[model samples]
Target: RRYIVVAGRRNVGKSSFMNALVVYKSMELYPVGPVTLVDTPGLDDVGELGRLRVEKARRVFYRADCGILVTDSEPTPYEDDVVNLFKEMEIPFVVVIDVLGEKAEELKGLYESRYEAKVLLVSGFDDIGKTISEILPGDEEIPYLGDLIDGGDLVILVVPIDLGAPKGRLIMPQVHAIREALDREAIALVVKERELRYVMENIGMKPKLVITDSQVVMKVASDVPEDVELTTFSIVESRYRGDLAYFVESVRKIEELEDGDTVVIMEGTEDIGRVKIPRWLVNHTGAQLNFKVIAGKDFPDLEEIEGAKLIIHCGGCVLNRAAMMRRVRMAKRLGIPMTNYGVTISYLHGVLDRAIRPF
Candidate 1:
């Protein structure tokens, strides 16, 4: 399902209006018909925590497929911030004017004259159109690894269902890789970490590529021979959605680390970031580096990373391109180098050149 975020100032009834839309359409909840409407807190919220919530809301802009900016009849002073933020993020949104004291045409005219944005009018349940259909075009395509493969080739996917794996289904990157292989008419061989060696030795033919989870990249890289291409799911996903050249180049900065230099590692799971990557970095570089690790979406504040020399991020297979780029932009804005798990692992293991060859 695509995400449709509802954003606006405080007391604008953004939440109430969203609920009303759900009720009107008889949806299960805030989600309906391929669209999940997310209500963001007011951009005009006050206090220390309030501003933090506002920052949180702005971060959602990076994940939204599109946006809905709700406002009252009168123009809001904070509208400019929302407009500029959406423009910078390149998110498309329609201005929703909840008519109370002003006419629909008047409100529409005001916004169009100011922001040159699309405007919609809604006062009651009946007045709201099927805005979800109008807002979501159902055209956005999530990047898949299949596009990177050649027709009639073989690709091995190493998926370890360990403590970190979700309860039932495969993760996004794994699922996408399988689907992409089919899309490319390529063969996708699925295997666990224990079976990687057996599969590689007995598969009878050399696979075109080998993709594995970042957590076991070191192990998989050692098992797979040098003649066959090797990579991690995160690396392919990064290349599929982000700036590959920049991320690959950032691996060189690892060599520049000094004893006192600080490096921050950002990841989604605790085991990989807290244990695996840190251990590998220390073992590979032998630098008395001050390493800080944070998991999930809670990226460190700018001040926390200001003195740090580098930022290492996860593959971000679960996040959208804009969200991943947002982190890249954050580090770039501060002149700090940023690299991903796959690149770092391959570099540390002396297989960086072989790993990136498929690209």
Candidate 2:
């Protein structure tokens, strides 16, 4: 998993390059692990030093694991500054010449010798994935949990106990968390939702991380101390496979929901969406909200989601990046805001910032 940001000076096909690289596809889930593509304002705003757009673009680099610097021709002053910024920030990146195989070799030769960053050329934008595949940081897998803990650290895994796997044993995300803790040599304390408060208060344990099931997010948030890091299973899964950063921004739409408004809750067949999340919205919004939950394989189009105030999607553990982004584009086309369960729960409970604090 990697946080890949697409950026360059104005009008360099940055947006188109991202769109070409699996940003939208009504197709099968890619076999690859999650690699989120993020876009930013062009890096060449010539205004006051502290203008918002340039500042915003610069700030996006703070959390990025990699950068895709796009340019159509010879590097201009702004592109030079971008490469310089990438160097100064020490962010590993790949450069793309967006000139339809025309100046690709020419630019590649120059950029290869000049910056040493792997430069790939694109006409159909076909090589973006291959370039990404070739130039990742560690070639390692995604959204970190071990980095937030240390060897011999105590991390709490809050399960409801009421919610076991559909087949048998612990849920998939829970198993992954425990396994990661084991691999990291950290002590993972498995506590049910009922016992979370008791364990936190009586054991005097200084936990490095407190990750919970999304259904019990608000409650787990209440029990965990403010200083301790906390988030939901859905959030972890969201980061692992879905779009966490986009959901974080889209979550603000909850505030605009009003009485009798139509809202779509995508994939509400589970207890979290069908039972808890709907009630959470009503309570948080002080409204008698109307929910149209979509649980089956086929997602709704614009006409189906008509009159909806917002779209609240599940954490999307199983869906791939293309499918998830398809729904995002669907919502975007309909002019409706979309967010996932983890982000919505955290925002509603005033833990949005804290939950994502680890990342």
Candidate 3:
């Protein structure tokens, strides 16, 4: 089924609206295939981050089969910003007006009197559209432990017990890998870098692949048995999400860096500010890549960014495809080649060759 995209400026209740609609349309509660409802980040922030996210949202609108723009009851100066953004993207969307003093009917009339496209009313029932199509959970079964292990020829996961790591449970990425390995009926063995030698000697069986956290890539590389492939979840996921070749080639630019070169490391979304392209790049390359985040109106000073020799970016996990494409377009306009975090990490580790290439 076509995907549904929810978009608007920050604090417009866009994300809330998505949750509400999902609950209202509830496929799990009914009988049907799953409906994919994608929620996106706010587009009205500052910095290069802000520009990138806004661009991402606009792109989402173009590809969305259906969309809603959340506007509050009051008329604010920023309403025009929302209007202009939709105008530029030319997306077909309905304005979801919360009934404070004004009703959805009244809001619909108000918009119909001015805007050229359709305006829908969001009611407690299926007022806007046929309650978003239902997605029945029973249509698919969750994989068994053996199922994951078998299909995943060799599953590699990056599991680090850092501050953010939960006391007992594994991180999402780690658990996902292990489960997949078992489901596929494949062997699943895990190791910390310090334990690699012991694990290798005891197993006596070479793994099909070795996975490690981006932080310990070099360490993992040293111990992984030769002839076995290696990868990181970040790098694997980056290739899974977007243009693999584009990111790989872009990251290769790190080799061109000199001591004083300027670098801009950008996260794909605000939520990922905690994640970076592994700290080892600095120690290994001995070059300081200037770090900056692009979020919430935090656009960079173009004058200050003019000479940046490298631009490291994220794969835009929270962003829709359109938004990702928009950023790529903008980077091209600025004559900057943008690469994702995974590729950059692989590049610095002398293992860019392991990254998946685009077909």
Candidate 4:
């Protein structure tokens, strides 16, 4: 879901604007279709405690798809700080006059002239549907499984319900792929890796596509016939949710690995990032590489990852688009190449050409 954060100085009705959202909120979540409205604390906080609040609020931009800078009639220059922060993060924002008064137009004009961004005139008590419409991605078609399947196509989803799989539920990419396939009127054959070959042989039918978890790409590639198109859920997701082209290009960086080069792999557990990818890199590059793995969101300290040659990230099913983009941007800023698990695994397993054929 796209995240929209509300930001402004205290008493600017930021909280009231959050309440104006009719979407039900449970602990700061206001889910509405493909977007979620995020309520953040005032951005113009000061003092020791207030400085911490400001830091927290700034961190919110890393996860936010867009932002709303709310202000009342008595707008201050502090709003400029919020605007600059959004600019730095590359998060598009709109200035909102949250008070109902004659000054709404004036304030809107002032913000528009100052920030060169769209300004919305709204009252905390007023209906916010129009405001939401303006903030959303609108009718743009984001790629799902629809592009790969037709109304009658057969899609085999290879899910390994192992220790790494989420407890009693499919991960985000798998769940979204299934839903998208169904929405496109495609037949989705969901199977575990152990049952994959059985389905392929006994079913006696060629599937239009086989999508598997990145961890089992090599296994699935071997079981599925070469004629049958194969890919991982993460690869398809990266095209829609991340920089697929950049990731594909970065995959070649794995070959550039030399002895003693530091490679930082981010955010996956023992089964995948910690063991599988590291082992594959060592074998593929035949280099005495220095590997460091960070699990969960335990990002490495800057000093630890500073001299790294390449950064490998997981499929990022657990992160939002903004969060994933932040990693990409950080790597680019540091003049290092970054690639994700899907692309890297595909490259290592010798199925990259077939896997990325759809895109």
Candidate 5:
């Protein structure tokens, strides 16, 4: 499915846009019932936190096929910020004016005069879906499932059998990737580390890609052909969630971290809550890597939080775009690289893109 990221300074009707798009009826300031629109903590005039929120928003821009920038005819001259950000990221976006027919002039004039973004006028109060639907041709070309995965590409999945590992069930990512490959009629070969080479040799074909759990990155990398594209599921999900560049740079920050550094890892429950990270990852990063998982809880204030070289966040399926942007932003501003749960795991596993190591 194609994903679109909605962005704006907190409370400029971003929530309203997301609600309208997701069709969540229960979200309200009072007597609010929960609808499944991913929600984020509003920036609400909080300075540093506000910066974090913006950063989170930035991460999603390139990740999505298109972005919707929410704005009010509120006379706030955000034209410069809005225009520059889109241009800098090379992201095509549409300006969504919150005031529908109330205004005499359409945003086309302002958009054309001020920025490169395409503009659309609609009230969050009205038929937002229809409004967006009308713009489908210009919206963006979200790659189809088949287009995303080609059958000609060989996909190798490493499934290590171990006593400590969860029994029988494959992880969500592995399962997802395998299915995507099959849907494209791609060859998906599964093997453990010991049998990896055997599968490659017998297949008699050069694999296009190798995806393995981080726990066995070193060995998997050793066995896989150097020409093959390689990444862990975590990194792949980061791309899915719109954090590719951040992850590409996450590896560079690893060298800057010293031996006794602490790190933070927060899991996103389908984008809902932040929780402490898995203990296994903490140990894997080495003794110096201390962390706070923050599962299913509000993400901590990065300003007061301390003692870490990096912050690793989750897919945020449970949380909204704002929250994820906040964490991503804070990590960047703090001069600490921010990465996703999957990306972090990939780094420890040694399966990050060789061209851009994120660990």
Candidate 6:
């Protein structure tokens, strides 16, 4: 499936148009799966409303393989900004001038000439293209651990069962690790926390890499021999989503914590951020630190993070590239440090080098 985002200034019928797509091409209502529509449109982004709109724009494009730029009026500067960003991101898009308004033709000619884009005169779907073969050239594939190993190599994935664990199925992070390994023809060995030692010592399956969950990173690090590569799913996920170097650079700030310094730990999982990481940070730094933990995916406002010395985020297993990059950019712009759970744990346990060694 591909992503098609509808973007433009306010008051264009983008929302209603998208609703019509669902209504006609719906679920047993005939639910259409060909297009994963991300309803985020608003050409202008500056104020509080604009910031949210802009945030959606910045985050939405990471997966937007194609774009539908909806507008009713002549092109405005905001529309130009949208088109420019589309070009910069290499997202192939079409400009839809809805309505038989006189200026639609003028705007159509201008967009076609200036941007070399196909302008659709979609007044009540009069000239809408087939949207896929008629529009996009396709995009690249998602990143994976597959890149690090080839066919015939062995990879070990460690997962720990907990009270909070989902029943009947392995969670998504573990699923992808197994899926990607199989896709690349690598042998993936799945085991509980204890079995890692049981298999490694007796059967002696020397894997090319060992990837574990963050909570058991230190134990996995200690159990896996120094000869084989080691890492966490979180570290690999962070690398896939955003810049690993940003986390690597910001992680050193952990060593600089001092008495009374404020550190904010934001997480999608509460246990690691609230208990383990904080405990490890105190044990490592020996500093009387002020720690604040926020649960869930909500990031604090820019003004809120400004007061903290460092921002520690979770592995961002569910966050897309755009969301992670925005946080990296925000923290960089503010001169505050930001790092993630897996990277921090590895660094704290003195295995940071070995964990990221595969990269």
Cα lDDT of candidate 3 equals 0.52
Q: Tens-digit lDDT track for model 5 on 1-359? A: 23344555557366655645332233432112222233234423434522333465454343433345665554243434544655565444566643466352555556556644344544433443434344333422222222433565555454454524376776655666677677777777777788987886787666655665556666766776664454344335434444456765785576566556766666533332232344544345445555555554655554434556776666535454444554555465455677675555555544335323232
* Clash statistics: count for each candidate: 0, 1, 38, 0, 26, 5
Mark the regions of model 4 whose C-alpha exceeds 4 Å error after superposition: 1-148, 152-176, 191-206, 213-225, 228-243, 268-279, 292-304, 357-359
Candidate 1 worst ten-residue window by lDDT:
23-32
RMSD values, in order shown: 8.6, 9.7, 12.3, 8.7, 9.1, 8.1
Off by over 4 Å in 5: 1-112, 116-149, 152-157, 163-168, 225-242, 257-296, 301-309, 314-336, 348-359
lDDT for 60 in candidate 3 is 44
lDDT of 1 at 255: 84
RMSD of 4: 8.7
**lDDT winner between candidates 2 and 3:** 2
Q: Give the C-alpha miss distance for residue 259 in model 5, angstroms.
A: 10
lDDT of 2 by residue, 71-108 (tens): 66677666666666566655567877343464577777
lDDT of 3 at 160: 51
TM-score of structure candidate 5: 0.51
Q: List the lowest-lDDT window of 10 residues for candidate 5.
A: 28-37
What C-alpha lDDT do the candidate models reach, one value each?
0.63, 0.64, 0.52, 0.64, 0.51, 0.63
Span of 10 residues, lowest total lDDT, candidate 2: 23-32
- Model 4 scores worst on lDDT over the 10 consecutive residues at 23-32
